Every structure is written in C-alpha cells, then in structure tokens.
Nucleic acid binder design. Sequence first.
DNA 1: ATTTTGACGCT
DNA 2: AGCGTCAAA
Length: 430
Amino acid sequence: GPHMATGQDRVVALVDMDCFFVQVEQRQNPHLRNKPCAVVQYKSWKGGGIIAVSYEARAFGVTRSMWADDAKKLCPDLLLAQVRESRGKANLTKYREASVEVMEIMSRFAVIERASIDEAYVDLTSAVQERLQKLQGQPISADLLPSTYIEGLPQGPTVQKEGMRKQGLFQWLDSLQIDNLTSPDLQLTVGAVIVEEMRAAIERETGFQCSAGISHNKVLAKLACGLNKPNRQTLVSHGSVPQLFSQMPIRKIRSLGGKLGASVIEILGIEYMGELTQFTESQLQSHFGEKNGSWLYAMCRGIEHDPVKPRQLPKTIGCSKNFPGKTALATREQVQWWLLQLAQELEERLTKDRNDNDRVATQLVVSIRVQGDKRLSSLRRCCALTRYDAHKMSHDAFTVIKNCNTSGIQTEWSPPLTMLFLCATKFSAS
DNA sequence: ATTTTGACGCT
DNA sequence: AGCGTCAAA
Ligand SMILES: [Ca+2]
Ligand SMILES: [Mg+2]
Ligand SMILES: [Mg+2]
C-alpha cells in the first residue's frame, strides 16, 4: 500500500536509429533514398550476407541474415550497398563514425549510455525537472509531441494511423495533472517533449531518423521504442504495464530472448510476462537464482533499477574474421598473415582512439576457433599490450596461440582455424 | 557459409 | 583469468 515502491522515480529514454547502416549509405548516395535497399557484407558467396534493410525492403520480406541472392528473389529491384573492405576484411569505420556523430548530438541534452553502435539510453530525470520549473504550471500542448504515441491509448467509448495517434495523445493530455511537479505521468510527458527535441536535433544535424521509447526504466524504454517504428516515439507509463504485459511474450523483454527466457517459459508453464506476477519472489529465486529471481519479480510489475551508466565510448576495440568451410587456415604463414591484417586494422583504430579520447588499452585478447568446435570461441588467451604496433601485436598473438597447433609438421596448422579475433581491452587514462 | 562486433555474469 | 550468455548493424 503506502510503502510499496512503484519504480516511478526516473525518466529514461532509449533512442534507436532506424535501419542505421542503410541510412548512412542513403545519406551518402541519394540514389538509394526512398528505395528498397539493403547493406551487404562481401559479395562472392551468394551475393553477400545482408546486415541492414530499409523499411521499404522489409515490406517484401527481406531480412537481416539473408543472403543477397535470396533477398533478390523476394525483391528483384532491391538496391544494395556494400560494406567497405580493407586488408581483406569488412571495415565498419563509416558506421562507427556516423554513430559518434549521433552520440555527440545526444550528449548535449543529457547523460547517455551507449548501448550499441546505433542505440543509446538517456537519463532524463534532471532535464525533466528543469523543464518543469521553466514551464511554470503551463499545460503541455499536443504540438510539442508531433510524433509521440501513448501506449494503451486511445481506449473506451477515425480509422487512419495518425488519427489514432492523436486521439490517444489527446486522451492522455486531457487527463494529465500538470499541477503536480512530482507526478510520474507528467514527468514522462515532459521527458517525451525533450526526446522530441533531441530527435529533431539529430535529424537536422545528421539527416538520420530514429525512434525512441520513454518510460521509467531501461527495459520499458527499450520495449517502448520498438512499439512504433520507424521515425516515432512511444511513451509507456507505469499504468500501461499490466495490460501491455498481459499479452507480451516473455522473449520480447531484454535479456529474456535466450535460454533463461526459454527456461522461464518451460519451468513455470507460462507464455506472457504478466503471468509472472502470480509467483512469490522466493519461488522465482528458487527456480532462477537470487539475482534473476528478484529481477523477474520486480520486472513483471514494470519495476527495474539498472542505472543508465555514464559511458559514451565502447569499453573494448576488436577485430575479427571468420574463415568458414574450406577457407579455414591450415598453414602457419596464413595464420600469421591474417594476424597481421587484424593487428593493422586494430592499430589504426587504437591510434585514432588514443588521439580522440585520451586513453590507452593495456591488454590484448586473442581468440580463435578450431574446425570442429561447437562453441563460438575454442580458445581465449590474453597478453600485455605495450605498444600500438601491428607487427608486435601480431607477433604476441601468434606467440600466445602457437601451442594450439596439434600438427607434428612445421608449416602446417591443425586443426585448421575457422576464426581469429583480436580485442584491445582494459583502457587507462593517458 | 550470416559476419562482425560489444557488454556483462559466473566461477 | 577464461568461459558463457545476450544483444547489435
Ligand atoms: Ca536500429
Ligand atoms: Mg538498435
Ligand atoms: Mg535490427
């Protein structure tokens, strides 16, 4: 009752660029704008593997992970842009730089947590309080929320999408109590006003469109973001949670898309997130462990406490290449040549990182997979990273993996290597 | 033969 | 420290 916390203390947004790599290529090549297009890596094997797809192409059924030849079967007029290749491998530099562009715009508004190359969480609590004192009890106009959906509305006693959006927003604003500065729904609404402004700034200054979720925690912000894509934002209030969760498959909640979510479904015999409310915390802890149990118990009620971490920069810098099927590396020289290629790209990125962000990596992680191994990594070993020098780094990696060669012969490597991975970690200020 | 990434938990 | 899980374009 009067003491049960409700997790309404923060305003958190999640901003996710729409079909990010496609928008990077469409900005660069206007011929691709407003067309079914996709971004592909490599070209030789089945036309390349698709990694990003415009909404126009998704309408034909084109997806990520599809081979371009197969996507062309679904969408004969599909346009393709190829990821740059350098030193024999895919090079993602253009997209990393466009991402930095967007994160720097977002950082002007608030503390952000970089969640991936194209997504960031935003803690808007303080900015919301400032906007609320500036507003001075003034009602919030629908005009300040031109692309906002209110999850769960309209409800109760037009057939076009934008009509429904405005009806729901009108119901929400009609209800709002702008008299109380501590009102969580008012705080979320002001959050949404700020996110509209941030999204406008991103589009004005980069050309890129994005979607956003606004709620009281990261999990609900992330779920909200996906409810109305592309180029829209969705507010998920605390009161919307019971109905939203009553038909929400467990796997849709972040961290439950894999084995743990599968076990929640199997062990408890449920399908939707709301059904979790019928278990005690101790029951959930018994099945899924103390940490997971407590998390599930609060989450199914819409409550989560994971903070938006102040981290705008990635914590590791890695380079990896697969050598699938018959291309697996079977000679010592091949292995050394590819270690050099990886180390040269890594050196270039590390040097740029040191100049831009005043830090230096101190550990080099080398990972390999051998033909036959079921796991993603067959071997992970670390060593000192003392100089941003590709020849030294490639030598150190070879030194640390050379004992993996079963082969009795000199020049041959067995079992053949199907993957190489170099990752610089453990950054220190410089 | 999705590939190339990046964060975080367990022990 | 090394391994596993979950997620991203
Ligand atoms: Ca995206
Ligand atoms: Mg995303
Ligand atoms: Mg995606």
